[PDB]
Amino acid sequence: KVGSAHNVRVLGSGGTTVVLGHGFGCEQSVWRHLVPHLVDEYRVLLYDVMGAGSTNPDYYDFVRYSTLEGHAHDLLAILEEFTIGKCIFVGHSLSSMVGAMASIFRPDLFHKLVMISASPRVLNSPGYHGGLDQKDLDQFLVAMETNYKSFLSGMAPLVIGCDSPAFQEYSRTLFNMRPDISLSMARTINTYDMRPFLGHVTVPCHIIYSREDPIVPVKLAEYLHQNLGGKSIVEGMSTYGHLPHLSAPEVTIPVLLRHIRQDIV
Amino acid sequence: NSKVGSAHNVRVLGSGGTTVVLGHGFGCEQSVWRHLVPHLVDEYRVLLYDVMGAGSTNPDYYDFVRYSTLEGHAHDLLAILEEFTIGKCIFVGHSLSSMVGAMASIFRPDLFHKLVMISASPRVLNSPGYHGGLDQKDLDQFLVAMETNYKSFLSGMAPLVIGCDMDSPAFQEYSRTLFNMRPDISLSMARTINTYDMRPFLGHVTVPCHIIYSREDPIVPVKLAEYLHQNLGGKSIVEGMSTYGHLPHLSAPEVTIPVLLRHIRQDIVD
Ligand SMILES: [Cl-]
Numbered sequence: 095k096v097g098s099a100h101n102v103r104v105l106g107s108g109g110t111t112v113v114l115g116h117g118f119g120c121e122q123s124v125w126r127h128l129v130p131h132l133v134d135e136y137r138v139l140l141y142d143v144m145g146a147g148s149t150n151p152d153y154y155d156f157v158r159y160s161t162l163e164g165h166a167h168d169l170l171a172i173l174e175e176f177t178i179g180k181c182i183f184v185g186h187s188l189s190s191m192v193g194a195m196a197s198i199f200r201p202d203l204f205h206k207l208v209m210i211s212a213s214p215r216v217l218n219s220p221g222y223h224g225g226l227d228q229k230d231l232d233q234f235l236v237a238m239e240t241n242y243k244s245f246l247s248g249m250a251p252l253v254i255g256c257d258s259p260a261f262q263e264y265s266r267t268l269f270n271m272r273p274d275i276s277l278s279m280a281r282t283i284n285t286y287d288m289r290p291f292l293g294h295v296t297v298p299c300h301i302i303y304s305r306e307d308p309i310v311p312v313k314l315a316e317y318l319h320q321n322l323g324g325k326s327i328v329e330g331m332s333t334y335g336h337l338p339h340l341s342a343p344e345v346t347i348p349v350l351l352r353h354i355r356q357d358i359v
Numbered sequence: 360n361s362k363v364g365s366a367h368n369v370r371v372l373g374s375g376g377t378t379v380v381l382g383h384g385f386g387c388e389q390s391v392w393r394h395l396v397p398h399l400v401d402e403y404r405v406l407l408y409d410v411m412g413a414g415s416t417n418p419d420y421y422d423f424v425r426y427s428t429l430e431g432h433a434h435d436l437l438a439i440l441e442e443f444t445i446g447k448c449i450f451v452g453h454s455l456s457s458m459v460g461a462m463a464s465i466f467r468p469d470l471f472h473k474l475v476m477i478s479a480s481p482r483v484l485n486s487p488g489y490h491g492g493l494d495q496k497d498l499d500q501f502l503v504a505m506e507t508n509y510k511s512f513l514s515g516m517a518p519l520v521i522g523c524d525m526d527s528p529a530f531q532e533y534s535r536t537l538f539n540m541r542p543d544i545s546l547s548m549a550r551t552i553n554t555y556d557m558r559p560f561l562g563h564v565t566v567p568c569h570i571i572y573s574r575e576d577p578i579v580p581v582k583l584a585e586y587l588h589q590n591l592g593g594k595s596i597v598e599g600m601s602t603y604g605h606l607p608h609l610s611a612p613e614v615t616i617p618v619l620l621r622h623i624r625q626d627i628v629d
């Protein structure tokens with residue numbers, strides 16, 4: 095039931111499983127440049143976040159997935175059913191914080207977290223620059239609801255940092271979502287706040303960021319580094335855009351492989 | 360039953376569309392609610408469950424890092440609510456479970472109509488501007504004794520915490536579940552309950568909270584009820600009871616149950 099609802103796919107073999115969680119507007123196919131480098135050494139688990147176009151719209155509970163917790167409980171259900179022991183969790187954007195929260199609920203299931211383009215909170219706050227003002231978020235959400243296809247055609251190039259073979263792939267999965275579900279997920283990712291809980295994350299975290307992410311300010315990597323409760327390490331990449339694992343896999347995948355295989359300290 | 364249901368001995372009783380969820384405190388099991396349940400079943404669905412680590416649960420399911428935080432237990436509560444409820448529950452939590460429920464309501468406020476807290480404390484330790492009631496040196500020596508002479512520590516602790524006669528049914532019930540716990544797990548839970556700090560999280564709680572306290576609670580200063588009242592992020596109300604002990608829902612049900620029923624049935628204005 096859980097494996098079908100999330101298109102769970104297991105590849106490779108080994109005593110350690112690597113779990114890959116995609117971000118908004120993507121599907122598990124976004125990891126295609128990474129999986130072949132891992133299967134010979136690791137078991138690799140792929141899954142789709144509920145609400146992706148590849149998933150059944152009947153399973154999208156709008157109240158449950160108005161919160162980050164609903165996606166975290168989905169991840170935990172996937173790990174309990176399909177893994178054993180501790181896994182290496184890799185998560186881009188939304189799924190990086192999904193995994194952060196899931197590791198507080200079940201630290202006994204994670205060896206480490208590898209975060210790509212991670213942000214504990216997008217909205218600006220008195221002493222915190224997430225990169226987005228509340229009144230701008232409201233305008234983006236209204237614009238997304240009224241002129242859906244026009245909004246996505248302008249946003250996704252900016253998010254990839256492009257426009258244009260680099261963003262065609264992201265466009266395919268982004269428009270695969272149903273507009274009402276896409277709008278609900280966009281609100282959840284732009285309104286969660288993981289700041290109060292970072293100090294209770296105890297598993298090692300590898301913080302990977304794009305040095306020119308339009309959604310994620312560079313200083314947030316340092317913010318995460320300073321406020322996570324356990325050990326962490328930070329590495330920046332000379333990439334442009336919010337999805338470096340898709341637009342620039344020749345630079346991003348070697349970085350991911352290094353932080354997956356090597357442990358802090 | 361379900362995986363989460365069997366792990367926590369989930370039991371569902373009562374009748375009607377609104378569900379009252381009862382979460383017990385340290386050293387108790389769901390049988391601590393013996394006097395409240397029969398006053399609810401003709402009007403409310405009642406969900407009972409055991410906190411992981413209680414003697415009635417499987418020791419193999421208790422991971423010491425997992426349950427070293429309130430989030431670990433709140434995850435279990437959220438799993439239980441998502442599985443056995445579809446509406447907004449009325450959560451009644453004693454001591455440990457009052458903060459578990461508060462923490463759970465931060466992740467999913469949509470699942471809670473209100474929180475009814477019994478003997479609640481956001482932090483036991485004293486700090487420069489905050490009187491939790493216990494100094495660090497006392498906690499350290501309690502935890503050492505709890506590890507060095509565990510049964511001797513428990514035998515001296517139980518009658519003082521429940522504060523009632525040892526020839527009473529309240530002490531028998533409490534002593535049974537307290538000694539039912541596995542010692543290493545008991546020490547783990549005691550370390551968690553005496554080291555969590557909910558003060559930074561109170562402002563993020565937004566569901567209505569009813570703060571019920573025992574005026575002579577040997578564990579919880581009366582003043583903390585007002586501290587919770589001042590610092591919770593949503594509506595809250597305070598009511599004290601002329602009872603003696605930390606577990607008045609078990610030791611003084613004639614006083615406590617009428618108070619709980621009123622706060623379960625009435626919203627915060629009433
Ligand atoms: Cl995202």
Ligand SMILES: [Cl-]
Pocket residue numbers: 384385386453454455456552
């Ligand atoms: Cl307790």
